Design a protein around this ligand. Structure first.
Ligand SMILES: O=C(NO)C1(COc2ccc(C#Cc3ccc(CN4CCOCC4)cc3)cc2)CCOCC1
Ligand SMILES: [Cl-]
Ligand SMILES: [Zn+2]
Ligand SMILES: [Zn+2]
Length: 267
């Protein structure tokens, strides 16, 4: 496909899930070859794995003393739409969580795409690889299309569930919301996270209960969301990705470990 930017500046705002602070984004058009980067307080932070500073409960980037939490949702949307050149100006410390999904970003960006004059140079997975950490595993292998499967093994009523994204099915994962288990909320608060989490932006589940009165958007909403997160973390390779991925219980730490191993192997 062609490299793409946005036709005009696009703004989003609201509370961040971890900081609980209100922040604002401005997405700016950029020329061919710029890449995806964030901008905060005069500093450009490329959306690349070298700038990862934290991976527990979100993927966060930093450079030169400026940090931005929770980049994975906006990056997943840009990856799915194949937007390749843009500056995400952040006024605040975190990307707004909005409803917990990528929907509002997706709908707004998709209607504002500007095709550019060069083709995309994809990051093409060249050979099979497996990364592992304490029972969690991710496998990547060659594919002409981006294909991503996540399999979860939940310790509640959901049990085992799997979901596969393929190209053309972006609408199947951009509405799946971030989620949390009630027995884990004390830990996330104790480590200074989840300050913006509420039933308005998170699907909260108990051992047997669904807290949200509106219920699940899909019976497998959590694994759809985990696929969505992994697609965002894969964009830290610095180019849209062609490969087939399978994650068993992966999280941001393992997603970034895979990205760094793929990047080292091919560059
Ligand atoms: O989406 C992701 N990363 O991209 C992941 C974000 O982690 C998180 C996402 C959300 C949270 C949270 C929260 C939270 C939500 C609601 C209340 C309010 N209470 C609910 C119980 O009743 C009383 C009122 C209180 C707290 C915590 C962590 C990390 C990877 O796993 C998927 C989720
Ligand atoms: Cl932690
Ligand atoms: Zn933790
Ligand atoms: Zn997420």
């Amino acid at each position: 496909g062609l490299e793409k930017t946005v036709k005009e500046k696009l703004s989003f705002e609201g509370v961040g899930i971890h900081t609980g602070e209100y922040s604002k984004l401005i997405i700016h058009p950029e020329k061919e070859g710029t890449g995806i980067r964030f901008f905060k307080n005069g500093v450009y932070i490329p959306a690349r794995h070298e700038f990862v500073v934290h991976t527990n409960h979100s993927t966060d980037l930093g450079f030169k003393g400026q940090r931005i939490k929770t980049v994975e949702h906006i990056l997943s949307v840009l990856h799915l739409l194949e937007i390749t050149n843009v500056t995400i100006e952040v006024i605040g410390n975190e990307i707004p969580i909005l409803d917990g999904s990528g929907w509002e970003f997706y709908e707004a960006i998709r209607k504002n795409i500007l095709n550019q004059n060069r083709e995309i140079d994809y990051f093409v997975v060249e050979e099979p690889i497996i990364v592992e950490d304490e029972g969690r595993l991710i496998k990547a292998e060659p594919s002409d299309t981006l294909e991503v499967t996540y399999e979860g093994e939940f310790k509640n009523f959901l049990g085992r569930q799997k979901f596969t994204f393929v190209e053309g099915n972006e609408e199947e994962i951009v509405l799946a919301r971030t989620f949390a288990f009630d027995w884990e909320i004390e830990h996330i608060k104790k480590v200074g996270l989840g300050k913006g989490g509420s039933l308005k932006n998170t699907l909260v589940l108990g051992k047997d209960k669904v807290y949200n009165p509106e219920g699940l958007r899909y019976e497998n909403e959590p694994v759809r969301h985990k696929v969505f997160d992994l697609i965002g973390d894969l964009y830290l390779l610095g180019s849209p990705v062609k490969g087939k991925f399978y994650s068993f219980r992966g999280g941001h730490s393992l997603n970034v470990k895979l990205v760094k191993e793929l990047a080292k192997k091919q560059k």
